[PDB]
Amino acid sequence: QPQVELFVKAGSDGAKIGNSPFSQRLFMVLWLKGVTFNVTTVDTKRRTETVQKLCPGGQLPFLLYGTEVHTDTNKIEEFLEAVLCPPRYPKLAALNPESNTAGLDIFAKFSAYIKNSNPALNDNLEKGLLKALKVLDNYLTSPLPEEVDETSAEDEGVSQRKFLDGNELTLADCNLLPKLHIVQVVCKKYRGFTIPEAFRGVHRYLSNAYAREEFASTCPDDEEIELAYEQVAKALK
Ligand SMILES: [Ca+2]
């Protein structure tokens, strides 16, 4: 196995992994593949000569695979899925195309809500975030094709699967979960906002996800995430 090294932005102390749903996405993909790899953080205020030589363009995250450097989070993920493949490594791509789009707009709705400083827009922006969460909830409670015409469900016509695409973590979860994590941490701290308990699909999904070390152990600590958003989030008076 060629060496696999993921380079990611360092956090506030210049050493630990910094806030980034992109870093975490790739960390999760690598963990779920079962490949041997490591992670090197990059203090972007003090780049080492080694990192400058590997990636003169300065993009982060980036992947060193053998002696070749790959940039662009989406492209890195596609490369990893293709090269770390069966029979040696598990295919992580979702079976259902909609799994790959469900809930992604949540991050944008969150970003508008958290960066807004106009008091007149707070309620509207919160509603927009809530609605996008509801659409994700609807996806998670809609039976997938695998579940066709089943009769074992507790509530008729309601999906009980663990994750976006079925009962296994897929690339789709690796994209969405790090984003949902940021949304939860930042909204609780700076907006007094939590995902309603009434969104039972979303909550079952998050419960299942936090119970998996591939997700839980790749989350930056609450403090780094909160610090990353402090300036934009405090603007609203
Ligand atoms: Ca509230």
Coordinates of all heavy atoms in Angstrom, one line a residue, residues 21 25 28 99 101-107 136 140 164 170-183 205-206 215:
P21 N -15.4 21.1 7.8 CA -16.1 19.9 7.4 C -15.4 19.1 6.3 O -15.7 17.9 6.1 CB -17.5 20.5 7.0 CG -17.1 21.8 6.5 CD -16.0 22.3 7.3
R25 N -14.6 15.2 6.6 CA -15.1 14.4 5.5 C -14.0 13.4 5.0 O -14.3 12.2 4.9 CB -15.6 15.2 4.3 CG -16.0 14.4 3.1 CD -16.5 15.4 2.1 NE -16.9 14.7 0.8 CZ -17.2 15.4 -0.3 NH1 -17.1 16.7 -0.3 NH2 -17.5 14.7 -1.4
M28 N -12.9 10.8 7.7 CA -13.9 9.8 7.8 C -13.8 8.8 6.6 O -14.0 7.6 6.9 CB -15.3 10.4 7.8 CG -15.7 11.1 9.1 SD -17.4 11.6 9.1 CE -18.3 10.0 9.0
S99 N -29.4 10.1 -2.0 CA -28.6 10.1 -0.8 C -27.5 11.1 -0.8 O -27.1 11.7 0.2 CB -28.1 8.7 -0.5 OG -29.1 7.8 -0.2
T101 N -27.5 14.1 -2.2 CA -28.0 15.4 -2.3 C -28.8 15.8 -1.0 O -28.8 17.0 -0.6 CB -28.7 15.8 -3.6 OG1 -29.8 14.9 -3.7 CG2 -27.8 15.7 -4.8
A102 N -29.5 14.8 -0.4 CA -30.3 15.1 0.7 C -29.6 15.8 1.8 O -28.6 15.3 2.3 CB -30.9 13.8 1.2
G103 N -30.1 16.9 2.2 CA -29.6 17.7 3.4 C -28.4 18.6 3.2 O -28.1 19.3 4.0
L104 N -27.8 18.5 2.0 CA -26.6 19.4 1.8 C -26.9 20.9 1.9 O -26.1 21.6 2.3 CB -25.9 19.0 0.5 CG -25.1 17.7 0.5 CD1 -24.4 17.5 -0.8 CD2 -24.2 17.6 1.7
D105 N -28.1 21.3 1.5 CA -28.4 22.7 1.5 C -28.5 23.2 3.0 O -28.6 24.4 3.2 CB -29.7 23.0 0.7 CG -31.0 22.5 1.3 OD1 -30.9 21.6 2.2 OD2 -32.1 22.9 0.9
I106 N -28.6 22.3 3.9 CA -28.6 22.7 5.3 C -27.4 23.6 5.7 O -27.5 24.7 6.3 CB -28.7 21.5 6.3 CG1 -30.0 20.8 6.2 CG2 -28.4 21.9 7.7 CD1 -30.0 19.4 6.8
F107 N -26.2 23.3 5.2 CA -25.0 24.0 5.6 C -25.1 25.5 5.1 O -24.8 26.4 5.8 CB -23.8 23.3 5.0 CG -22.5 23.8 5.8 CD1 -22.4 23.6 7.2 CD2 -21.4 24.3 5.1 CE1 -21.3 23.9 7.9 CE2 -20.3 24.6 5.8 CZ -20.2 24.5 7.2
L136 N -34.5 17.1 5.2 CA -33.6 16.0 5.5 C -34.4 14.9 6.3 O -34.3 13.7 6.1 CB -32.4 16.5 6.3 CG -31.5 15.4 6.8 CD1 -30.9 14.5 5.7 CD2 -30.3 15.9 7.7
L140 N -34.9 10.9 5.5 CA -34.6 9.8 6.5 C -35.8 9.0 6.9 O -35.6 7.8 7.3 CB -33.9 10.5 7.7 CG -32.5 11.0 7.4 CD1 -32.1 12.0 8.5 CD2 -31.5 9.9 7.2
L164 N -28.1 7.7 5.8 CA -28.7 8.2 4.6 C -29.2 7.2 3.6 O -30.3 7.3 3.1 CB -27.8 9.2 3.9 CG -27.6 10.6 4.5 CD1 -26.5 11.3 3.9 CD2 -29.0 11.4 4.3
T170 N -21.9 5.7 4.2 CA -21.5 5.9 2.9 C -20.8 7.2 2.7 O -20.7 8.0 3.6 CB -22.7 5.8 1.9 OG1 -23.6 6.8 2.2 CG2 -23.4 4.4 1.9
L171 N -20.2 7.4 1.5 CA -19.6 8.7 1.2 C -20.6 9.9 1.5 O -20.2 11.0 1.9 CB -19.2 8.8 -0.3 CG -18.1 7.8 -0.7 CD1 -17.8 7.9 -2.2 CD2 -16.8 8.0 0.1
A172 N -21.9 9.7 1.2 CA -22.9 10.7 1.5 C -22.9 11.1 2.9 O -23.0 12.3 3.2 CB -24.3 10.2 1.1
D173 N -22.8 10.2 3.9 CA -22.7 10.5 5.3 C -21.4 11.3 5.6 O -21.4 12.1 6.5 CB -22.8 9.3 6.2 CG -24.1 8.5 5.9 OD1 -25.2 9.0 6.2 OD2 -23.9 7.3 5.4
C174 N -20.3 10.9 5.0 CA -19.0 11.6 5.2 C -19.1 13.0 4.9 O -18.4 13.9 5.5 CB -17.9 10.9 4.5 SG -17.6 9.2 5.0
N175 N -19.9 13.4 3.9 CA -20.0 14.8 3.5 C -21.0 15.5 4.5 O -20.6 16.6 5.1 CB -20.6 14.9 2.1 CG -20.6 16.3 1.5 OD1 -20.4 17.3 2.2 ND2 -20.9 16.4 0.2
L176 N -22.1 14.9 4.7 CA -23.2 15.6 5.5 C -22.9 15.7 7.0 O -23.1 16.7 7.6 CB -24.5 14.9 5.3 CG -25.7 15.6 6.0 CD1 -26.0 17.0 5.5 CD2 -27.0 14.7 5.7
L177 N -22.5 14.6 7.6 CA -22.3 14.6 9.1 C -21.4 15.7 9.6 O -21.8 16.3 10.6 CB -21.9 13.2 9.5 CG -23.0 12.1 9.5 CD1 -22.5 10.7 9.7 CD2 -24.1 12.5 10.6
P178 N -20.2 15.9 9.0 CA -19.4 16.9 9.6 C -20.0 18.3 9.5 O -19.8 19.2 10.4 CB -18.1 16.9 8.7 CG -18.1 15.4 8.2 CD -19.5 15.1 8.0
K179 N -20.8 18.5 8.5 CA -21.6 19.8 8.4 C -22.7 19.9 9.4 O -22.8 20.9 10.1 CB -22.2 19.9 6.9 CG -21.1 20.2 5.9 CD -21.5 20.0 4.5 CE -20.4 20.4 3.5 NZ -20.8 20.1 2.1
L180 N -23.4 18.8 9.6 CA -24.4 18.8 10.7 C -23.8 19.0 12.1 O -24.4 19.7 12.9 CB -25.3 17.5 10.7 CG -26.1 17.3 9.4 CD1 -26.9 16.0 9.5 CD2 -27.2 18.5 9.3
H181 N -22.6 18.5 12.3 CA -22.0 18.6 13.5 C -21.7 20.1 13.8 O -22.0 20.6 14.9 CB -20.7 17.8 13.6 CG -20.0 17.9 14.9 ND1 -20.5 17.3 16.0 CD2 -18.8 18.4 15.3 CE1 -19.7 17.5 17.0 NE2 -18.7 18.2 16.6
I182 N -21.1 20.8 12.8 CA -20.9 22.2 13.0 C -22.2 23.0 13.2 O -22.2 23.8 14.1 CB -20.2 22.8 11.7 CG1 -18.7 22.2 11.6 CG2 -20.1 24.3 11.7 CD1 -18.1 22.4 10.3
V183 N -23.2 22.7 12.5 CA -24.5 23.4 12.7 C -24.9 23.2 14.1 O -25.3 24.2 14.8 CB -25.6 22.8 11.7 CG1 -26.9 23.4 12.1 CG2 -25.2 23.0 10.2
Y205 N -30.8 9.5 13.1 CA -29.6 9.5 12.3 C -28.4 10.0 13.1 O -27.3 9.4 13.1 CB -29.8 10.4 11.1 CG -28.7 10.6 10.1 CD1 -28.0 9.6 9.6 CD2 -28.4 11.9 9.7 CE1 -26.9 9.8 8.7 CE2 -27.4 12.1 8.8 CZ -26.7 11.1 8.3 OH -25.7 11.3 7.4
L206 N -28.5 11.1 13.7 CA -27.4 11.7 14.5 C -27.0 10.7 15.7 O -25.9 10.6 16.0 CB -27.8 13.1 15.1 CG -27.8 14.1 14.0 CD1 -28.4 15.5 14.6 CD2 -26.5 14.3 13.4
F215 N -17.1 8.8 13.0 CA -17.7 10.1 13.0 C -17.3 10.8 14.3 O -16.7 11.9 14.3 CB -19.2 10.1 12.8 CG -19.9 11.4 13.0 CD1 -19.4 12.6 12.4 CD2 -21.0 11.6 13.9 CE1 -20.0 13.8 12.6 CE2 -21.6 12.8 14.1 CZ -21.1 13.9 13.4

